[PDB]
Design a protein around this ligand. Structure first.
Ligand code: FAD
Length: 149
């Protein structure tokens, strides 16, 4: 993967505002800000890579910015951080992974409980919520994920 990052950074605050102001919320998230664990992935780059990770996310997972950026978030599904696309996870519920996959493809909001592992191999249940995000063109370009241990 050779993901490219937006020169000048991402409008994370603007996107959080967009999310809290969305008209027909399918999932209630309650107020959110930059203090919580979150990531923004680019739907328009190969394998929906993380292009921004909040400090709280890195702290929760134990991974560094260098270890997460440019990667699809699925690495959290294995204690060795090695998860190949389309592979059958041995520690994660297949229907759960398919639910996330379909929600992302359809730009549909979703909330799931998925088993994840921190960098040091510590297992935990991640209550994950993903909401599609529109960029300046007004069309869905990113997805913001909010992780909860
Ligand atoms: C912003 C954002 C944040 C995210 N944060 C996290 C996070 O914190 N933790 C995390 O674990 N993931 C996270 N994800 C999810 C991850 O990045 C992938 O989107 C997710 O694993 C599903 O996509 P995939 O490409 O891995 O699917 P695939 O690799 O295709 O795997 C889907 C699995 O489902 C099974 N399956 C497929 N179709 C069917 C079917 N019809 N019936 C039965 N089984 C089926 C397969 O056997 C396969 O193993 C995040 C995604 C985004 C966009």
């Amino acid at each position: 993967m050779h993901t490219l990052y937006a020169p000048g950074g991402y409008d994370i605050m603007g996107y959080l505002i967009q999310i809290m102001n969305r008209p027909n919320p399918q999932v209630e998230l309650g107020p959110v800000d930059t203090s919580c664990a979150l990531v923004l992935c680019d739907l328009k780059q190969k394998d929906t890579p993380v292009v921004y990770a909040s400090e709280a996310f890195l702290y929760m997972t134990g991974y560094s910015n260098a270890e997460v950026l440019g990667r699809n978030c699925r690495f959290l599904q294995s204690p060795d951080g090695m998860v190949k696309p389309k592979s059958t996870r041995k520690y994660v519920d297949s229907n759960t992974i398919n639910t996330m996959r379909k929600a992302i493809d359809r730009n549909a909001e979703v909330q799931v409980e998925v088993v994840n592992f921190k960098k040091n191999g510590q297992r935990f249940v991640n209550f994950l919520t993903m909401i599609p995000v529109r960029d300046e063109t007004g069309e869905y370009r990113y997805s913001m994920g909010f992780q909860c241990e």
